[PDB]
Design a protein around this ligand. Structure first.
Ligand SMILES: [Cl-]
Ligand SMILES: [Cl-]
Ligand SMILES: [Cl-]
Ligand SMILES: [Cl-]
Ligand SMILES: [Cl-]
Ligand SMILES: [Pd+2]
Ligand SMILES: [Pd+2]
Ligand SMILES: [Pd+2]
Ligand SMILES: [Pd+2]
Ligand SMILES: [Pd+2]
Ligand SMILES: [Pd+2]
Ligand SMILES: [Pd+2]
Ligand SMILES: [Pd+2]
Length: 213
């Protein structure tokens, strides 16, 4: 078909967090049916980033999700035409991240065009102070509204020193063609920074995702 068992990844993110502009480019690979993917990121403008890299990582494609055969796959059906998504992340100290991403396909490589805005982060908060230590494993509730798929995550970031920092995710996924719509289901996530140079100019992100009834 169009979605191979091995697919490459290319992306560009143009970002602005509390007024600080930056550009990140990435390349990687994954196994869509296994629900795993790795992306190697480079900061192109804005290095070194003056905020927590964790607020970017979940922006760096649910095509990479293991789906049981009996739950229709909203994301894989959308190709070759593809899909786009938009996300609002609300942090417990009133910081906000807004993301738009367009996911397209060429040959055996996905292409992401990402725009990300962060705002209202307290100067002394864990994001601006770079005091976060990654995301917990999460469960995203997927449900259909207005002919598109929506996703909810009551998430938390882990903090340096053992604390935690709650974040609500709301995502809207929009296929660029008609597909068989699934009903209420869950996607379990695990996302991790595998390695980084000092100040995170070069970072590798790994994610696994599995859907379930
Ligand atoms: Cl492989
Ligand atoms: Cl949204
Ligand atoms: Cl190839
Ligand atoms: Cl918890
Ligand atoms: Cl069941
Ligand atoms: Pd393979
Ligand atoms: Pd290429
Ligand atoms: Pd480069
Ligand atoms: Pd662009
Ligand atoms: Pd805004
Ligand atoms: Pd700042
Ligand atoms: Pd420290
Ligand atoms: Pd809604």
């Amino acid at each position: 078909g169009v979605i191979k068992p091995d697919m490459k990844i290319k992306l560009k993110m143009e970002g602005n967090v509390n007024g600080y502009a930056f550009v990140i480019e990435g390349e990687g690979e994954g196994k869509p049916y296994d629900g795993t993917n790795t992306i190697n990121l480079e900061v192109k403008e804005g290095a070194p980033l003056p905020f927590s890299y964790d607020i970017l990582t979940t922006a760096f494609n649910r095509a990479f999700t293991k789906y049981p055969d009996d739950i229709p796959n909203y994301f894989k059906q959308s190709f070759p035409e593809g899909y786009s998504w938009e996300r609002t992340m609300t942090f417990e100290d009133k910081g906000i991240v807004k993301v738009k991403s367009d996911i397209s396909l060429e040959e055996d490589s996905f292409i992401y065009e990402i725009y990300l805005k962060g705002e209202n982060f307290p100067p002394n908060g864990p994001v601006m102070q770079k005091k976060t230590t990654g995301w917990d494993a999460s469960t995203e509730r997927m449900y259909v509204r207005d002919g598109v798929l929506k996703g909810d995550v009551k998430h938390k970031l882990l903090l340096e020193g053992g604390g935690y920092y709650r974040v609500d995710f709301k995502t809207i996924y929009r296929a660029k063609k008609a597909v068989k719509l699934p009903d209420y289901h869950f996607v379990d996530h695990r996302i991790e920074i595998l390695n980084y140079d000092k100040d995170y100019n070069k970072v590798t992100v790994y994610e696994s995702a599995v859907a379930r009834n």
